[PDB]
Write a protein that binds this ligand. Structure first.
Ligand SMILES: NC[C@@H]1O[C@H](O[C@H]2[C@@H](O)[C@H](O[C@@H]3[C@@H](O)[C@H](N)C[C@H](N)[C@H]3O[C@H]3O[C@H](CO)[C@@H](O)[C@H](O)[C@H]3N)O[C@@H]2CO)[C@H](N)[C@@H](O)[C@@H]1O
Ligand SMILES: [Mg+2]
Ligand SMILES: [Mg+2]
Ligand SMILES: [Mg+2]
Ligand SMILES: [Mg+2]
Lengths: 54, 91, 102, 212
RNA sequence: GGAACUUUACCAGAUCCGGACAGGAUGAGGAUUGACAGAUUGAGUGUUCUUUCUCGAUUCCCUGAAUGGUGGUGCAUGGCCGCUUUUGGUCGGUGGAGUGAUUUGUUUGGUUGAUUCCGUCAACGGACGAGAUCCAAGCUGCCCAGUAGAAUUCAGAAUUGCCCAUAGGAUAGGCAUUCGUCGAAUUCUUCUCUGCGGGAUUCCUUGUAAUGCACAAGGUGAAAUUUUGGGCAACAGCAGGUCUGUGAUGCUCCUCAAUGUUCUGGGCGACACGCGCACUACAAUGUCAGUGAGAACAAGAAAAACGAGUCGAACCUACUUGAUCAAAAGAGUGGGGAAACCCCGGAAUCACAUAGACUCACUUGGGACCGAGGAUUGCAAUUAUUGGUCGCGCAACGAGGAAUGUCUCGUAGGCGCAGCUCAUCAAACUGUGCCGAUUACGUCCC
């Protein structure tokens, strides 16, 4: 029966969110509605445009 | 959903995939896929497009590369010649 | 006048001046009576993550920044004369925006 | 509704970051070397830098045709909005991203690790580079992993000016016994126009001028 | 890593295949999909058994396989990080030395934070690290503003003097002053914003040193010695951490009652106890109740969805209301894509001649513990999500044993505020401002 992903249909939680690069749902940067995982961002900060000035 | 793909969907996905040549589909297993034959009316779920293409690649008909969260599937020289027989088209 | 405001926004500091000074040097040739290019405050964008992908070590951090450069120019030309000022192939990464004031 | 200017610099960065990852995976054996995209009304430009322009283009453009519509179907562009081009790198020896993908194939074709890496550095240093550094790390010799670096010429590393002068790219080589990672760093020589290398000299070179 | 579900990796169950593709036997005279009512069940879960219709080659049954795993091994690896190390260190070439490992360069002398420099010198020429470059703060030029502000001049309005608080001190003084007054004008860049640029160099001065490299004191100045504060950092290495970040990975385990994946319910949070780290205090340099003056960094709404290629609603917010009567709410109505609205950002320490209560007590200190209403977040509040109201306060705690941590100026300490986690929740962390010291400017004792 299609009770199949009934908890993942409603999208309120930490499981509904996801790293858009790296498919993980642990420790994502949601500031500026960025939605990249913590580790998968530092690999990609230069292409997004962030550079560590200080 | 279900990887049980209906026959009116499979030929409708193949009609798009021979025409444009490529299908890009998100890895989201609760979301749809939308393609266009002028009417943009497919609303095929993404679960079934993965199943259709995993059957194709196992028959070594397509070339798959995967970006961040999107698949990108392309027809081959054998794959175009195979796709024409399923849709019954002139070369 | 129609008082069209062009918004020059960019991520590069050297590309936002090479558009604005070029866009201004166009709008002197038709004698448009511009109100000069003002420098709106640059907005820096901080994401301060950990450095480690694991958990251990000294808890070190690294702040990333991203500055948005922002310029506006007001000019009294009609709406197809400002498209003469606007139309030139710019540098990549500079957004221009045409807005009509009142 | 429109997003704020702060919200649009984000989505324009994540656009370029995702576009860069797709072409890095596709065009690895086409010698891919970067993207620049130019957006305006009526068309969105994408220029692809490569070393093998007969291969990133198809027989009649077939390869870039498929590679166009992969970007179109993903990012929901409409017909006429998205046009792609291919430009070639003029030097091929000053592009660290191209040389590391070739060094990836020199190992995957079962050649010797040190013979492959000096073949890069001979080719990079004859191409006018001021210096080069190849690091191969992994299970080179046996069960336990080693690291070897191979060096020639100058190499600036501690400044924040090394982002301007040193070109770097790291890929993974998937051996039969494990995983090897290769790195290639190339110090850009010259090219005051910005063809490959900065206009200004190094931050500590003084170069007093001679009087007339 | 602030987990209610999810997250999730754990436990008790229950589904689903997301076992592709091959090869072999059933197969359209049907391979099979799905489900109403009952029984089964935790389940108005077709999971299954009864019942019969739908689906129409997608499947299913065997065999071989393959793909999934937050399964294992970080002592098989890549990558990144940490740490050796806040240190001044490493490397060739060619010459010299030695049978050789190896030396020399790379140094005994002064000097600097610095193998930083000067001098010497069997070495001479180079490369990296250091310095430089980069960011931020302080003073400043040009440019600049119906997204920043200012003055003026006419009009409009307000006070206008004889006034000495109940007991009433200290303290500036041609044309008096004040401004949703949601006024008109007409001149400006003083402050504001900011792209590139000036300015600082031991520059000048007179003891240390004695050629030199430099040093101390003072000048100059906005700034005086790496100007301040950070970023970046070589070469080697650790059998440090991460296979719980990845569609990073090799090997190996599990692989249809699966260690896959989803539901449902628990758990991660359970308390004789031992420790790290905060928070709150032990009060009168205070608690309370008033009243005043008054910050900086910042955030802010949505999709190929559902609605009217364009527009709405999700986000933050002022303002009214609720209000012929508690908070917390709940509602209207505006505005804002964020220098344009919040906003003249009314932070909290502080302040006050407030003629305010307490008066040295476990007390009006402290607010742990828990009782009873109530209202919001959520699909769900029980093992109180959170706020607010009245109780409890008879819970230690009166300044802390042996020990121990951080710090040299807008600093320590105190004080709050943003952002980040976030539907709801900060005793956290990343930032920012406010108030603002004691001591040293030394040494090798540990
Ligand atoms: N990259 C700078 C490094 O500074 C090192 O030297 C540093 C040390 O001698 C010394 O650093 C000390 C540090 O040792 C000790 N553990 C703590 C002390 N606060 C530091 O002091 C330094 O930093 C702080 C800035 O917050 C200042 O108070 C002080 O002026 C400064 N001397 O001061 C120097 C920093 O200016 C080394 N010379 C070298 O590793 C390197 O050059
Ligand atoms: Mg948000
Ligand atoms: Mg073409
Ligand atoms: Mg020798
Ligand atoms: Mg004791």
């Amino acid at each position: 029966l299609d009770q199949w992903r009934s908890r993942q249909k409603i999208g309120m939680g930490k499981g509904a969110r996801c790293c858009v690069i790296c498919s993980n749902q642990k420790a994502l940067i949601r500031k500026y509605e960025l939605n990249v995982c913590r580790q998968c961002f530092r690999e990609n900060a230069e292409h997004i445009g962030f550079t560590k000035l200080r | 959903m279900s990887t049980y793909v209906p026959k009116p969907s499979r030929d409708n996905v193949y009609r798009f995939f021979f025409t444009e040549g490529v299908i890009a589909c998100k890895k989201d297993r609760m979301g749809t896929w939308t393609g266009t034959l002028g009417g943009n009316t497919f609303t095929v779920p993404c679960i079934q497009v993965m199943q259709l293409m995993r059957s194709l690649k196992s028959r070594n008909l397509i070339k798959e590369q995967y970006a961040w969260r999107h698949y990108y599937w392309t027809l081959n020289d054998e794959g175009i010649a195979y796709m024409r027989s399923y849709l019954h088209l002139a070369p | 006048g129609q008082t069209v405001r062009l918004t020059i926004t960019s991520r590069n500091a050297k590309a936002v001046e090479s558009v604005t000074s070029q866009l201004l040097m166009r709008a002197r040739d038709e004698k448009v009576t511009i109100h000069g290019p003002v420098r709106l405050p640059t907005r820096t964008l901080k994401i301060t993550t950990r450095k480690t992908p694991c958990g251990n070590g000294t808890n070190t951090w690294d702040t990333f920044e991203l500055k948005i450069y922002k310029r506006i120019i007001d000019l009294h030309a009609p709406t197809e004369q400002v498209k003469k000022i606007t139309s030139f192939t710019m540098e990549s990464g500079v957004d221009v925006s045409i807005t009509i004031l009142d | 509704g429109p997003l704020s200017k702060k919200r649009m610099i984000i989505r324009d960065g994540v656009f370029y970051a995702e576009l860069f990852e797709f072409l890095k995976r596709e065009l690895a054996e086409e010698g891919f070397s970067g993207v620049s995209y130019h957006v305006t009304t009526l068309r969105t430009e994408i220029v692809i830098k490569a070393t093998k322009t007969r291969e990133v283009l198809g027989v009649n453009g077939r390869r870039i045709r498929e590679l166009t519509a992969c970007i179109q179907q993903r990012f929901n562009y409409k017909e006429g909005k998205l046009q792609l081009y291919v430009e070639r790198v003029e030097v091929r020896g000053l592009s660290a991203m191209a040389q590391v993908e070739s060094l990836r194939f020199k190992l995957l074709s079962n050649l010797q690790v040190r013979r492959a890496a000096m073949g890069i550095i001979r080719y990079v240093m004859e191409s006018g580079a001021k210096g080069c550094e190849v690091t191969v790390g992994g299970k080179i010799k046996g069960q336990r992993a080693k690291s070897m670096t191979f060096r020639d010429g100058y190499m600036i590393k501690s400044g924040t000016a090394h982002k301007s002068f040193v070109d770097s790219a790291c890929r993974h080589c998937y051996m039969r016994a494990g995983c090897i990672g290769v790195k290639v760093k190339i110090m850009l020589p010259g090219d005051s126009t910005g063809r490959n290398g900065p206009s200004e000299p190094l931050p500590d070179v003084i170069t007093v001028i001679e009087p007339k």
